[PDB]
Amino acid sequence: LRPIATPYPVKEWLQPKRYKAHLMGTTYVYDFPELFRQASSSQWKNFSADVKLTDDFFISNELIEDENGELTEVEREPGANAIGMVAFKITVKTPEYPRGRQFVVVANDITFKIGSFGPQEDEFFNKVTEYARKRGIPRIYLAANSGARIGMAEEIVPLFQVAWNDAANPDKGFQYLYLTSEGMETLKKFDKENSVLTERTVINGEERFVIKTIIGSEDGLGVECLRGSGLIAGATSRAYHDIFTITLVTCRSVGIGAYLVRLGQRAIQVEGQPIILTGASALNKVLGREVYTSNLQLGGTQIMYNNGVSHLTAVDDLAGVEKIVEWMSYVPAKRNMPVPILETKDTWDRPVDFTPTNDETYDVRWMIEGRETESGFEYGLFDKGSFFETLSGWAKGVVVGRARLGGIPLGVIGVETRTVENLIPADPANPNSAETLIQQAGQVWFPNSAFKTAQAINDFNNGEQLPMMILANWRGFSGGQRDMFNEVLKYGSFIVDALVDYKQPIIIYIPPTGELRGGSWVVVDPTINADQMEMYADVNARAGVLEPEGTVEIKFRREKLLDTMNRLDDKYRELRQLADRERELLPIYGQISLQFADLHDRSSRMVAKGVISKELEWTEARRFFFWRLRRRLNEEYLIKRLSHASRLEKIARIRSWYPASVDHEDDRQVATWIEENYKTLDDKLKGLKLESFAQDLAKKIRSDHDNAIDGLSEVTDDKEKLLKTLKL
Amino acid sequence: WLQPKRYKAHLMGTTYVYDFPELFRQASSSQWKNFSADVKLTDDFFISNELIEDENGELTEVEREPGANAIGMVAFKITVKTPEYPRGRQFVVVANDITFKIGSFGPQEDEFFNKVTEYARKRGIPRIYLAANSGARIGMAEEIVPLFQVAWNDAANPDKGFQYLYLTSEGMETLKKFDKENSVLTERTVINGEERFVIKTIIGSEDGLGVECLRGSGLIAGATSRAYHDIFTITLVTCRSVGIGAYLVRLGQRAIQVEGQPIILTGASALNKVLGREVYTSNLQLGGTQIMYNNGVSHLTAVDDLAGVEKIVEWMSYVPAKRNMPVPILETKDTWDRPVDFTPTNDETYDVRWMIEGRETESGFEYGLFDKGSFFETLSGWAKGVVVGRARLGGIPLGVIGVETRTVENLIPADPANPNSAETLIQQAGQVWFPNSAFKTAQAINDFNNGEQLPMMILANWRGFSGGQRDMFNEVLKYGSFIVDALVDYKQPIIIYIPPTGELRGGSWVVVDPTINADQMEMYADVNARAGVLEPEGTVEIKFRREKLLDTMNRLDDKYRELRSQLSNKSLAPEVHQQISKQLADRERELLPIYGQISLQFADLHDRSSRMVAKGVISKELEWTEARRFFFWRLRRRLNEEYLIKRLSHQVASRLEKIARIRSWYPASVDHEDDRQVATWIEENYKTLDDKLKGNAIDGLSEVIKMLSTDDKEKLLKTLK
Ligand SMILES: Cc1cc(C(=O)N2CCC3(CC2)CCN(C(=O)OCC(C)(C)C)[C@H]3C)cc2cn[nH]c12
Ligand SMILES: Cc1cc(C(=O)N2CCC3(CC2)CCN(C(=O)OCC(C)(C)C)[C@H]3C)cc2cn[nH]c12
């Protein structure tokens, strides 16, 4: 016992595995449910400080496989795990789900064979993934491992003989490895003849069983571990398209461990915990130099957070768990459940305070979440304190995050107007290589920011199942040599793909001082996904194929300019010396042609051409979007229910059921009627599924009387109900 | 008659649109010559009909005077008799007319392109796009140019500025007279006793000026993204392709770029204006083949339009006539029944292409795994560490992925925009996946799967993914993950084969394991292949350390064992003990190199195809010389069984349940493991098999049972009782 004389029992002595995990710089697996309890308790404190919590607000039940290999909930002592992979089913009452929400936590046990993935860990991880997938519930993975388990046939280590070239001089080499009749008998005695494949030969009157292949009796030595790695990689790839998936890198995550972090997409990396393939030491041996001093140079946060593999960083395990729980607060309790409304003190009915201006620099985040000013807080478009930024360490030209709009959660994409700079590190492996600083102009999509945008669209869509708002403000894609060579076209195309796949309402809004040009409009137009997309443009927004400077250079040339000077200038007209007057007028007429061009680029032309749904005023956008989104979600939910027929037919069907006094165009009135008539519309449609099922059998019976009656006859507690109905 | 437009196109460096069907006729005629020189062709072998919208706006085939196109986008429906489809195959060719408003995309061109895309998609037929354009159509309200007035700050001094632009009552009356009041949005004000109609927005009476072109661009970008998942899509860049035109090339994925024809976003001139310097001299510095073929946007290059059309027609020869039709078998003189001649050796460097398609040698041709002359390499200008292409195996077409074992080097160009930037040469070791080669592998898997609908073989030979700083920073994990995604989505048979001298390690095995897609994937390893988590040096470092090395020396070395034995005496003088220990340690030092080698062999003996077979991770261990004969019948049998699974899917279930049912129909004497026997039986019985194939609720029951007759109720009561 160390230390002695502590006020309470030494938890690191009661379970020595807890100390082993601490020695490795991570939390003991069986202590992670407690960290979830703390983070969930903190959630309530930040939401409503006055709320009193009972210990039944949070429930953690370990999941283990029974005799049949089926997952079952158990209460047992920490550290009784016969495999290096553990799981817990968590049931929490949260501010967004006061009656409770569930999720699954899968985790490597770093104390069990250094958290290596053997066939049993892989098959358990897969079973847990499938369990969460069948239930539609989130899958949290706590990665603390050393990749696929490595082993050798230990029973062959004390038996194998060496066939020397010269037994007197071992440095002269060997020809093969073999077993003696004794070695073969040893294996037969222990039922391990199958551990090796041998070819019998006779050298100097003695039997030599030359070893042709070593198999081993123990499972988990090599390729079988690789098979299991492939299984769970495929399982995670699938899971991401199905349920909310997230990973916390709590200690190292190696090989398959690194691939799982990426395949689950959403990742939170604890500072100092690397995500690696081959380690630095091994890479030094292969390279034949001491190139790297740490694994952090390969997969630390300075690598994975900067390249977007890690969406967020955490100072420690609890901070990471807090970030998981916060990220989940925007996500439905389970697949296909409505987005979780969390109304705070910042309600919908207010103007937007912070407004950008054409001549002044701003941070988009002020437009999104508001800005703290000396005169007080200037509220933004979304709920105060609701912006949860992600992928914040990578491709800073685009700003992605979750936010709330009057309590409605959604994904948000905004454009960083300020110039962004990133440091490409100097690789110690190449001495010729030096560190490089790249500068990227604002309101231009580059390969990395185009990739980030597509990634964000995909991560809001899959698992999160969130609606989205893109505050579209791009001049286009970088058409320069470097960026074209660096495949900007491929990354831009991913955006279209991501939009085509989107299954929740999308709002494209060109904001005040914002613009969309030829190259950028193409990848965000609502005709890409007309079932879900809508575009709006602010009254102070701009859009055209080219910028005014370009549209004047091509369509308002010298001939037009001079014909204008003749129409509008007394001196020029009197004269038509003319070249001298032309020189005098060139600056101001240049401004006039630019204005003439700019007057085509307005939200009013956009409305007239039928390319946007409405032109909007920024200060009123919060009030407008709140009711538009509330309405759009309410209709979507009805469409999904009505799927139990084209969407175009379903929307025409739904919008017809509205009382005649309801103005279809009135979002608030439509959204209000749907929510008030929900229980009634739940009844009205179930009572028509039954009316159809009644007419279904009334067809089958009237066509095939005695044959259907015999079918009814063929098809305990259900029989009792059916008896009661006959009895009346 | 067409000579002016034909010359205009030639001046641009492209073929006149209405002359492209002829280029397809030539390329199709050449296909037959290369296949069978003695075959005589009639004019009915090739049919081109123009597609136009009817009264109902529906696409219809027509014969009309070429050059009669009222829009800058034209389409043709082609019906060709090819070596792989002698009775004929169909496809659609969409093309910009470079002579019609410089091939710009206006609302009408976009809506036509979309209608043609949808037409091909509904029919399952390939969509060929011939890109020759200048992107979205640019315009201004020309009727407002001679009407607008300037509201000066001081009419006597124009340089003092202006406040707005306006129309007079005259201007407003002119527009009213021509039915164009809607061309502008105005605000009425009175200045100096005269009406000023302040211009708030210019709309214009002419359609196709700006945002309505941009909407149409978005429509066709979405349409092409969808088309790629649905039908075979390919693009030939025949003149410049700009903006939406550049995006269309990428969104259709498969692209053949004619040399000197650039794929660009903003042109060099405009970029020079924005940058405020003469940075670039040509569009080719931005989107020429030296850019797009080197980065994989362009899969292939062509010296001219006919060469490009020839490459389209060749690529199509591996592709089904239409979606979900079986892969087109094209048996040539190189039949299945032969060994594989070219064999790699561990000590001699080789080009994988020799293993794939064979090698011409002084002693004669050394045949490879696939049919002689069938290897059609693609993405050959980018990420050269991986080799991708279409090939034929006894006439069966398939996608092939192989590993370039030789070190690859690529030149990153110096951007004229950054003077501080210099050209860089990157060197990548063979048998290692880097970001670009991982991306190329995933791209290839996706392109064989979507539209092409081909089976695939991966000649797996990777030590892993590059785990170094540069490649990790350059997101190798993201590109490696795309491989898993691409495999999960695959819908045709996959064969993973670790070839002779080949290997698969911890990082590389994870992304190709058949448990990723058990319905379609299978793994095999050559008898001279290797696989383990780590390479032998790695394994001994973790699992055959000092203590194990010393224990072996104690077992196998006389001197070491004798000395260790001497340390058991309890009467030894401490200085004698120290000398025995020193001698023991000296002996250990002498033996460490050779015992290290022993441990390496001990490790290597675990890494064999026989352990792989014993562990059940591969289906069979194979001999390279017999692989062609083996894979031909394996693939033929799988294509046959796949066909039966689909047919059964329609009549009725899991894949496990579906093959089990189908295989239960095979005669009992048929060995399910005998590929040739199963394929032979199936093909002899397609028609017989076709005959076999052709041959809350409780509340609902409660509602209907209630309406039954007394006699019916009695029977239903008895059953419950
Ligand atoms: C004909 C014509 C068009 C335009 C125009 O509409 N844009 C200019 C180009 C951009 C889109 C808007 C803005 C930067 N950009 C780009 O490719 O930048 C690459 C790096 C970043 C390398 C400079 C395009 C996305 C302006 C002018 C000025 N003179 N003549 C013009
Ligand atoms: C512990 C241990 C493991 C391994 C091992 O199994 N591999 C070595 C690493 C590689 C995979 C096989 C080969 C190159 N490689 C890589 O990341 O290379 C990056 C650049 C290209 C930058 C050198 C891995 C894909 C060998 C040794 C030798 N001593 N100790 C070892």
Side-chain angles (χ1 to χ4, degrees), chain A residues 543-678:
Chain A
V545 182
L546 275 34
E547 286 186 328
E549 224 311 296
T551 142
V552 299
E553 203 215 315
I554 276 76
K555 284 278 156 171
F556 212 124
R557 308 176 68 176
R558 187 100 97 81
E559 195 89 357
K560 250 170 217 179
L561 203 46
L562 302 187
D563 287 351
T564 301
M565 284 178 184
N566 172 71
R567 282 173 59 244
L568 271 27
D569 189 74
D570 288 334
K571 296 188 184 188
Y572 205 88
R573 179 161 69 257
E574 223 280 83
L575 262 67
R576 193 207 277 188
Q577 290 171 71
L578 269 118
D580 292 323
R581 220 283 181 278
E582 170 188 337
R583 200 178 289 107
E584 292 183 289
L585 300 182
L586 246 161
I588 200 68
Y589 274 79
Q591 293 296 295
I592 297 152
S593 50
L594 278 170
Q595 200 64 213
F596 182 83
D598 188 79
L599 279 151
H600 296 283
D601 298 350
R602 313 295 179 89
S603 68
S604 304
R605 186 159 122 89
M606 296 181 235
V607 173
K609 298 314 287 173
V611 307
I612 66 170
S613 301
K614 291 198 198 294
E615 55 193 326
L616 303 172
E617 300 204 285
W618 173 251
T619 62
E620 299 323 307
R622 171 174 175 91
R623 280 161 166 144
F624 175 71
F625 287 134
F626 172 75
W627 288 108
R628 183 60 187 176
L629 187 57
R630 193 165 173 177
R631 180 256 166 84
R632 268 196 73 20
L633 289 159
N634 284 327
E635 277 180 334
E636 275 303 315
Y637 210 66
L638 287 176
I639 288 148
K640 282 183 227 77
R641 240 204 104 270
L642 207 60
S643 289
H644 300 21
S646 85
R647 158 175 281 257
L648 215 282
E649 289 172 324
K650 289 181 269 202
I651 64 106
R653 189 183 169 183
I654 288 153
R655 288 168 176 180
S656 80
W657 311 328
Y658 300 169
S661 62
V662 169
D663 171 10
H664 282 61
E665 306 281 281
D666 194 318
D667 296 319
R668 177 165 181 183
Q669 191 180 348
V670 170
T672 304
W673 187 78
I674 297 165
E675 295 180 27
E676 268 167 15
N677 296 67
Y678 191 72

Side-chain angles (χ1 to χ4, degrees), chain B residues 4-301:
Chain B
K5 282 167 186 176
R6 191 171 288 106
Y7 177 58
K8 191 157 181 64
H10 288 300
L11 235 29
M12 301 294 177
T14 182
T15 296
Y16 175 66
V17 272
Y18 284 94
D19 301 340
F20 267 112
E22 174 51 25
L23 293 187
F24 277 88
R25 194 219 125 247
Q26 278 161 216
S28 303
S29 181
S30 299
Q31 252 198 131
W32 281 107
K33 247 104 94 190
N34 305 145
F35 175 68
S36 183
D38 291 338
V39 162
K40 288 180 176 185
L41 292 162
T42 51
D43 281 47
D44 54 82
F45 104 95
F46 183 94
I47 293 150
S48 175
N49 291 328
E50 188 167 0
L51 290 165
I52 66 142
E53 292 170 62
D54 60 24
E55 319 102 68
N56 309 350
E58 292 308 289
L59 250 37
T60 199
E61 294 174 80
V62 293
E63 201 167 297
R64 70 176 180 169
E65 44 269 52
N69 58 297
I71 62 171
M73 194 72 71
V74 307
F76 316 99
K77 196 188 194 162
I78 293 172
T79 308
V80 233
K81 289 181 180 178
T82 68
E84 67 288 341
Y85 291 101
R87 286 178 178 161
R89 72 180 299 166
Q90 302 181 304
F91 62 98
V92 124
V93 172
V94 232
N96 298 285
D97 181 4
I98 202 51
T99 76
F100 193 121
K101 289 164 172 157
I102 53 164
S104 59
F105 295 80
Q108 295 180 93
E109 289 71 23
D110 299 337
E111 117 73 51
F112 180 72
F113 186 97
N114 181 250
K115 205 81 60 87
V116 174
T117 295
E118 285 185 336
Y119 176 95
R121 287 187 63 208
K122 191 182 187 177
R123 285 151 185 80
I125 55 167
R127 182 238 64 169
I128 287 56
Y129 169 50
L130 315 168
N133 58 263
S134 42
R137 192 168 291 160
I138 292 138
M140 295 193 321
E142 290 309 323
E143 73 278 27
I144 312 305
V145 182
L147 305 188
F148 83 92
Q149 302 299 128
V150 174
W152 307 102
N153 281 331
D154 182 356
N157 197 349
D159 293 62
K160 282 277 175 179
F162 65 99
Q163 296 176 191
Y164 54 90
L165 305 189
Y166 67 92
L167 292 189
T168 64
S169 302
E170 208 195 316
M172 298 292 287
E173 234 62 59
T174 301
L175 301 173
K176 200 196 169 190
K177 184 210 281 93
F178 292 99
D179 218 273
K180 296 180 180 186
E181 320 169 79
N182 45 75
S183 292
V184 281
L185 286 173
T186 49
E187 196 176 273
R188 136 90 131 82
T189 190
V190 178
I191 284 275
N192 320 124
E194 313 186 284
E195 272 184 322
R196 283 181 175 188
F197 296 92
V198 188
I199 301 161
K200 289 300 190 146
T201 297
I202 304 170
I203 304 162
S205 60
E206 184 183 357
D207 191 60
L209 276 32
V211 291
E212 72 281 67
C213 299
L214 296 186
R215 172 171 169 107
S217 283
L219 170 73
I220 66 175
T224 307
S225 178
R226 287 179 176 83
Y228 167 78
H229 291 294
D230 216 4
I231 54 169
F232 179 81
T233 59
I234 192 159
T235 306
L236 178 61
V237 182
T238 183
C239 191
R240 56 169 189 267
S241 204
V242 178
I244 176 55
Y247 269 105
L248 289 173
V249 349
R250 179 58 192 175
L251 281 161
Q253 293 299 334
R254 286 160 299 245
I256 303 160
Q257 192 180 186
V258 171
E259 287 174 10
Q261 318 311 116
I263 298 158
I264 54 127
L265 286 178
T266 290
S269 287
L271 243 32
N272 288 163
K273 313 271 209 299
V274 301
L275 287 161
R277 273 139 65 225
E278 290 296 308
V279 173
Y280 305 110
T281 57
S282 71
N283 286 150
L284 300 177
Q285 289 178 275
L286 308 173
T289 66
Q290 76 262 33
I291 300 291
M292 302 302 176
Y293 175 72
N294 289 38
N295 72 186
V297 168
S298 295
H299 290 223
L300 298 167
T301 69

Side-chain angles (χ1 to χ4, degrees), chain A residues 278 282-283 285-287, chain B residues 463-467 534-535 537-538 541:
Chain A
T278 300
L283 243 33
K285 313 266 211 296
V286 159
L287 288 161
Chain B
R463 294 171 78 196
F465 287 88
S466 178
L534 306 183
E535 286 188 329
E537 297 68 19
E541 201 214 316

Side-chain angles (χ1 to χ4, degrees), chain A residues 33-102:
Chain A
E34 175 51 24
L35 293 187
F36 277 88
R37 194 219 126 247
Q38 278 161 215
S40 302
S41 181
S42 297
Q43 253 196 298
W44 281 107
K45 247 100 269 175
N46 305 145
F47 175 69
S48 185
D50 292 337
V51 161
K52 292 174 173 184
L53 293 164
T54 51
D55 278 53
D56 65 283
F57 101 95
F58 182 94
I59 293 149
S60 175
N61 296 300
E62 186 179 12
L63 294 162
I64 67 143
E65 283 184 28
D66 59 23
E67 320 101 69
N68 307 350
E70 291 308 290
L71 290 164
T72 198
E73 294 171 75
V74 295
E75 204 170 306
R76 73 181 178 165
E77 275 294 274
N81 57 298
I83 63 169
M85 194 71 70
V86 307
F88 311 97
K89 194 190 196 160
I90 292 172
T91 307
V92 232
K93 289 181 180 174
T94 68
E96 67 287 341
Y97 292 101
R99 286 175 149 179
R101 72 180 299 166
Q102 303 181 303

Side-chain angles (χ1 to χ4, degrees), chain A residues 153-154 158 160 214-215 219 222 224 231 237-238 307 484 490-491 497 527-528 560 567 599-600 605, chain B residues 142 145-146 148 202-203 210 212 219 225-226 295 472 478-479 485 515-516 548 555 605-606 611 615:
Chain A
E154 290 309 323
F160 82 92
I214 304 169
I215 304 161
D219 193 58
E224 68 274 47
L231 168 75
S237 178
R238 288 179 177 90
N307 71 10
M484 286 289 266
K490 304 193 180 174
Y491 300 106
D497 294 343
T527 61
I528 289 167
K560 250 170 217 179
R567 282 173 59 244
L599 279 151
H600 296 283
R605 186 159 122 89
Chain B
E142 290 309 323
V145 182
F148 83 92
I202 304 170
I203 304 162
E212 72 281 67
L219 170 73
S225 178
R226 287 179 176 83
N295 72 186
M472 287 290 266
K478 302 193 183 173
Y479 299 105
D485 293 342
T515 60
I516 290 167
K548 253 171 217 170
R555 284 171 59 244
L605 280 152
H606 290 77
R611 186 157 121 94
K615 297 313 289 175

